Structure 1
Amino acid sequence: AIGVLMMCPMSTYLEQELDKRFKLFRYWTQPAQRDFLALQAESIRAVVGNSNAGADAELIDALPKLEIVSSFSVGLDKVDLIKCEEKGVRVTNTPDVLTDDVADLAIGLILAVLRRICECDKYVRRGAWKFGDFKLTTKFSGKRVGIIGLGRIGLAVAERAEAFDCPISYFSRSKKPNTNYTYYGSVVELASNSDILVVACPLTPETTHIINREVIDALGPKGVLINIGRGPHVDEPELVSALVEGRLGGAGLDVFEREPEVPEKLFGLENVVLLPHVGSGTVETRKVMADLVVGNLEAHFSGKPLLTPVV
């Protein structure tokens, strides 16, 4: 059997589908990993990763028979693509098939923060409705929605938001032709012109902390940050502090700079919503993603064109 190393427990269904076609190895269940590696290097010809654990230089080097990294994710920042090319390794990912769900999440977060849906449900559950009305909140429809990275997921968000009458603005390195959204040439100018700012760009050293104190200052005390990209896209300590002090209106967060660690100071804030990276986390979508990873592995090991190759 071909040895396939799965980096972490990302999908029981994927475990099943991999185990019936290959020799599935469960990296996360080995106490002494380096030795394990050394011990099964001769067998491991594929790596299956995701947004928590991919294939870095050091792993790739310990896996000298590695032929392909098939990521259970669209994001690729956990995979060393350069190293991959130097050692002959293909790389595939899962684009588009999760688009719908991550953009639905971004809209869910907007509403949950502006309409305090989470705070309302808690208010009710502790019997506080008996003593009075919940406070007034903020209207979503018609608000200015700015999107950083008008890509597959950014476009999907934009089109949902349009149906709520939101004026759409965006920053990308380049303007998407034939779109009537407002292009801005800098994240800071975008944030000044947005009630709501959505992060939908990939993570690279060039977009690391693209949400900084300046941007946060530009967004302001009435402004709301939606992060469905990657944790390190934001200078988390400056995000936490602007929220604690009231210098940023609020935030809906699916990803954190050091997940699953979430700064506990956020835990007492009522102008934030915090989710454990669930953008793609539905039965329907994880299924298709899993079949896609399988598909790429089965294409690779049978000499066919890969399905969603990146490298």
Structure 2
Amino acid sequence: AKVVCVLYDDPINGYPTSYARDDLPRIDKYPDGQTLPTPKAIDFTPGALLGSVSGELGLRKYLESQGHELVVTSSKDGPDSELEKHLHDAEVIISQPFWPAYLTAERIAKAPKLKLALTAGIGSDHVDLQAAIDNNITVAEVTYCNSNSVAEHVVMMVLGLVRNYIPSHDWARNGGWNIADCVARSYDVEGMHVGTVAAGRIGLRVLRLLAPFDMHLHYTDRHRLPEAVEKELNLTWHATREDMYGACDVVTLNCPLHPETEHMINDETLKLFKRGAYLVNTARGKLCDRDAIVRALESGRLAGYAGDVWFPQPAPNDHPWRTMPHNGMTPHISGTSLSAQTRYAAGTREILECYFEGRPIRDEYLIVQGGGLAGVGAHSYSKGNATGGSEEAAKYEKL
């Protein structure tokens, strides 16, 4: 069959064959006890760059030696992109969230041979789940591959915003000293209240990392955590998102994107935050109304915004979050550190091996199968389409 694999470009200075360090650290398992990916074999060296076009997720030897054709490209947005020439006979489409091939209803409709949309990473909101349901496309993603990596990135951005890292590094590199300019907006997080929206693999992990900072922890979610967990971390529960925001100095979003959470942070909900609250979002950019966030920063309602997710992706060159006041943005990188890519590259192969030998794909990897939500998808997503507006990604130009 044909596999289209959409990956991001290689570094601007070429694809490296040697790295800052020699190996990755050992990891035996994930916190809830889920095993790591178990492909029958891997053909890449752990620690390399796997998610760019020249890395290929290490899938080429495997795929060809079995008769299939692997098309690799970064060209994905716009009516004359490479993805668009290959839709007519694609059996399998693979993309990562960081550089997502948006499978809208019109793209699925052009794709008669399409059986499997695979997300190399976590979060499958860049596929129209309704259309995937209607056309019997399987949708899978690599559960847990980077949950802990995302949680680290959250804590990094919370400390960075609150202590004012980025502007302070600028004063050091431009030759200044400027202590008062740096600490005019520098606080400790000790004693602050921080809440997470959702406390699944990422959000629970965030709570556990912030406990020894002596922050007061707050959460909300569909269901409560086990009473053992709440008493271990001394948690304060809020029955709704909207009651949580007013109680928090720092809010972190860690829920999925679907019609029930699209634009939940807007001009109306921002009125509920404390003046000078801090907001961190590494979940999905579309959880926030884009201009409402710039107004809150400009007015002082928010003291700081930080995240690595944007809508669409890539974000147009003039996307306002790039230059708004008091921001600690990065491009979408938390779930594609070198350490994570090796786990998701392995998981991607494990799903392909199952697909191609006719074995069942692990439930924890499933989002959509056989005309409805399935596996992890059933507990996390609503039927619906989040991919409207996605065309605007075609406006981005490489530097």
TM (normalized to structure 1)? 0.90
- Which amino acid counterpart does residue 228 of structure 1 have in structure 2? T
The RMSD of aligned alpha carbons is 2.3
Count of residue correspondences? 306
* Contact 2:253 2:282 survives alignment (8 Å): yes
Alignment of 1:236-247 (within 5 A): 236-247=290-301
Q: Does 1:152 align with 2:206?
A: no
How far is 1:211 from its partner?
1.1
Give the Cα separation in 1 of the matches to 2:187 and 2:263. 28
Alignment of 1:34-45 (within 5 A): 36-37=85-86, 41-42=88-89, 44-45=90-91
Give the Cα separation in 2 of the matches to 1:17 and 1:228. 27
- Which amino acid counterpart does residue 95 of structure 2 have in structure 1? G
Give the equivalent residue in structure 1 for 2:264. Answer: 210
Give the equivalent residue in structure 1 for 2:274. Answer: 220
How far is 1:221 from its partner?
2.6
Q: Does 1:91 align with 2:132?
A: no
How far is 1:16 from its partner?
5.2
Q: Which runs of 5+ in 2 are unaligned?
A: 9-50, 64-68, 369-399
SS at match of 2:109: helix
Give the equivalent residue in structure 1 for 2:243. Answer: 189
- Which amino acid counterpart does residue 71 of structure 2 have in structure 1? F
Once the two structures are superposed, residues 143-192 of structure 1 have per-residue CA deviations (whole angstroms, 9 ceiling, x without a partner) of 11110111111111111011211111111122222232222122221110
Give the equivalent residue in structure 1 for 2:25. Answer: none
How far is 1:32 from its partner?
5.5
Give the equivalent residue in structure 1 for 2:5. Answer: 6
Once the two structures are superposed, residues 94-151 of structure 1 have per-residue CA deviations (whole angstroms, 9 ceiling, x without a partner) of 1212011101000000011011111111111112217877325111122111101111
Give the Cα separation in 1 of the matches to 2:181 and 2:289. 36
Alignment of 1:288-307 (within 5 A): 288-307=343-362
Give the Cα separation in 2 of the matches to 1:16 and 1:201. 27
Which residue of the other structure, out of 58, 74, 78, is the alignment partner of 1:17?
58
Could you say if the C-alpha distance between residues 268 and 203 of structure 1 is closer, same or farther in structure 2, counting changes exceeding 3 Å?
closer
* Contact 1:50 1:73 survives alignment (8 Å): yes
SS at match of 2:152: helix
Once the two structures are superposed, residues 209-256 of structure 1 have per-residue CA deviations (whole angstroms, 9 ceiling, x without a partner) of 111223322223320001111111011201101112222111112112
Which residue of the other structure, out of 93, 101, 112, is the alignment partner of 1:47?
93
Give the equivalent residue in structure 2 for 1:163. Answer: 212
Give the equivalent residue in structure 1 for 2:286. Answer: 232
Give the equivalent residue in structure 1 for 2:333. Answer: 278
Give the Cα separation in 1 of the matches to 2:113 and 2:322. 44
Give the Cα separation in 1 of the matches to 2:71 and 2:218. 45
Give the Cα separation in 2 of the matches to 1:124 and 1:241. 29
The higher relative CO (CA closer than 8 Å, separation ≥ 6) is in 2
How far is 1:78 from its partner?
1.2
Which residue of the other structure, out of 118, 131, 134, is the alignment partner of 1:70?
118
Give the Cα separation in 1 of the matches to 2:129 and 2:195. 30
* Contact 2:161 2:328 survives alignment (8 Å): yes
Q: Does 1:101 align with 2:142?
A: no
Identity of aligned residues (%): 25
Give the equivalent residue in structure 2 for 1:127. Answer: 175
Bigger CA drift: 247-256 or 77-86?
Answer: 77-86
TM (normalized to structure 2)? 0.71
Bigger CA drift: 87-96 or 145-154?
Answer: 87-96
Could you say if the C-alpha distance between residues 120 and 303 of structure 1 is closer, same or farther in structure 2, counting changes exceeding 3 Å?
same
- Which amino acid counterpart does residue 267 of structure 1 have in structure 2? T
* Contact 1:49 1:72 survives alignment (8 Å): yes
- Which amino acid counterpart does residue 336 of structure 2 have in structure 1? G
Give the Cα separation in 2 of the matches to 1:131 and 1:204. 44
Bigger CA drift: 289-298 or 10-19?
Answer: 10-19
How far is 1:34 from its partner?
8.0
Give the Cα separation in 2 of the matches to 1:285 and 1:59. 29
Give the Cα separation in 1 of the matches to 2:93 and 2:73. 10
Once the two structures are superposed, residues 24-76 of structure 1 have per-residue CA deviations (whole angstroms, 9 ceiling, x without a partner) of 113544845587236xx34x211112322243322222221122111112111
Bigger CA drift: 135-144 or 291-300?
Answer: 135-144
Give the Cα separation in 1 of the matches to 2:178 and 2:251. 36
Could you say if the C-alpha distance between residues 34 and 20 of structure 1 is closer, same or farther in structure 2, counting changes exceeding 3 Å?
closer
Give the Cα separation in 1 of the matches to 2:189 and 2:158. 8
Give the Cα separation in 2 of the matches to 1:27 and 1:168. 43
- Which amino acid counterpart does residue 221 of structure 2 have in structure 1? S
Give the Cα separation in 2 of the matches to 1:266 and 1:49. 24
Which residue of the other structure, out of 311, 323, 333, is the alignment partner of 1:267?
323
Q: Which runs of 5+ in 1 are unaligned?
A: none
- Which amino acid counterpart does residue 58 of structure 1 have in structure 2? E
